Amino acid sequence: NIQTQLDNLRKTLRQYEYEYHVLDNPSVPDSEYDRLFHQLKALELEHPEFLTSDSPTQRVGAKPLSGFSQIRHEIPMLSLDNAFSDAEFNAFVARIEDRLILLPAPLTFCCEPKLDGLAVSILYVNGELTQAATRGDGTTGEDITANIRTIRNVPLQLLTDNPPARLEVRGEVFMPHAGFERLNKYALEHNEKTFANPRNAAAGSLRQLDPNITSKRPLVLNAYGIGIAEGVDLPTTHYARLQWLKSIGIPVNPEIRLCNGADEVLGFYRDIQNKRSSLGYDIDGTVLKINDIALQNELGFISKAPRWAIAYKFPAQEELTL
Numbered sequence: 001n002i003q004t005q006l007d008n009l010r011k012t013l014r015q016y017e018y019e020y021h022v023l024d025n026p027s028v029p030d031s032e033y034d035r036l037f038h039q040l041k042a043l044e045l046e047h048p049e050f051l052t053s054d055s056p057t058q059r060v061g062a063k064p065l066s067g068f069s070q071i072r073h074e075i076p077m078l079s080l081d082n083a084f085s086d087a088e089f090n091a092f093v094a095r096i097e098d099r100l101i102l103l104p105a106p107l108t109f110c111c112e113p114k115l116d117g118l119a120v121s122i123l124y125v126n127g128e129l130t131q132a133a134t135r136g137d138g139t140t141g142e143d144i145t146a147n148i149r150t151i152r153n154v155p156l157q158l159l160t161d162n163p164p165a166r167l168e169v170r171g172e173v174f175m176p177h178a179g180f181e182r183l184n185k186y187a188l189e190h191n192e193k194t195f196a197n198p199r200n201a202a203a204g205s206l207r208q209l210d211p212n213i214t215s216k217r218p219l220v221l222n223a224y225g226i227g228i229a230e231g232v233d234l235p236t237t238h239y240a241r242l243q244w245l246k247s248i249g250i251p252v253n254p255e256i257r258l259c260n261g262a263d264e265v266l267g268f269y270r271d272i273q274n275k276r277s278s279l280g281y282d283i284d285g286t287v288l289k290i291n292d293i294a295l296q297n298e299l300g301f302i303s304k305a306p307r308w309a310i311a312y313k314f315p316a317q318e319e320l321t322l
């Protein structure tokens with residue numbers, strides 16, 4: 001029947017979107033994805049009663065919002081403390097060593113690039129994207145659902161036949177250098193406001209009231225974690241949770257690594273610092289996390305921040321000189 005044919009084309013598109021944006025390993029040429037997007041759109045136009053709200057053709061709201069509504073996160077987020085030196089980082093490891101009851105040998109960290117963008121939270125209900133918000137201050141943010149729906153590597157439907165009852169994906173939205181340079185060039189040509197750096201371009205784009213404008217902004221999500229998680233037994237380490245997010249079609253940064261012990265973690269920090277803008281987008285620092293979730297829970301938090309993670313920040317771009 002027509003409905004099943006429609007759903008088979010949409011499923012095919014969602015698989016190509018996963019391969020291209022999440023796996024970075026497309027199985028078909030762009031031209032095939034393009035023509036299939038056209039074919040789906042033509043069939044939906046012939047049968048509009050079968051349009052679905054999570055179809056690949058439905059990313060872009062037709063009208064601008066009047067303003068952003070405030071959102072209170074259902075589960076507030078911790079704040080993240082910063083380290084700026086190797087001594088600060090080693091002090092943070094030592095506090096863990098001094099607090100854990102049974103200190104494993106080695107102590108594994110999941111180590112991530114800290115994307116220079118805007119932090120966001122995206123809620124999927126029985127697999128469907130239903131709302132998204134800015135992180136804000138970790139307690140209150142703004143509802144940016146219509147903007148987040150435009151982002152090409154953000155799935156509208158999770159890639160699984162058995163999605164959690166509810167899943168909150170937390171991540172950073174950023175704008176790679178090439179897109180950022182195109183945006184600034186377009187803006188100057190039209191005498192519209194430009195952006196001082198990609199971080200501000202990503203933040204300003206996510207506060208664009210008209211999602212037709214936001215769709216033209218080349219934004220990318222990289223997920224860093226999970227809040228609400230109902231009807232799902234999540235893996236017991238953070239890195240396996242990230243691999244699981246990838247498995248269901250959520251984009252995660254490919255430079256994340258497991259590191260054993262303080263010294264390997266500093267190896268990671270120095271390596272990503274060397275790559276802080278050679279990968280085609282800006283990385284602000286690293287977020288270094290105890291990988292084992294039971295150890296995270298044991299370690300807890302103080303003053304709003306986990307004892308089990310630290311952001312070891314690079315020097316600001318303006319400190320980098322001859």
Ligand SMILES: NC(=O)c1ccc[n+]([C@@H]2O[C@H](COP(=O)([O-])OP(=O)(O)OC[C@H]3O[C@@H](n4cnc5c(N)ncnc54)[C@H](O)[C@@H]3O)[C@@H](O)[C@H]2O)c1
Nearest residue numbers: 016017020026027028029030031033034037038041057152
């Ligand atoms: N090889 C692959 O599997 C694959 C998968 C996803 C994206 N891509 C590539 O990524 C690039 C960026 O993709 P993008 O999402 O910005 O789209 P885009 O704006 O670059 O458009 C890509 C194609 O999709 C068509 N299209 C876009 N929105 C449509 C809609 N609502 N209805 C009907 N057709 C629509 C366009 O006419 C165009 O032919 C494109 O070059 C695309 O081919 C490739």
Ligand SMILES: *P(=O)(O)OC[C@H]1O[C@@H](n2cnc3c(N)ncnc32)[C@H](O)[C@@H]1O
Nearest residue numbers: 078079080112114117118119172224287
């Ligand atoms: P940025 O300074 O835009 O980050 C703001 C807050 O978001 C949370 N956060 C961002 N990135 C990460 C990762 N990779 N892991 C965990 N938490 C992250 C932190 O609360 C940042 O302070």
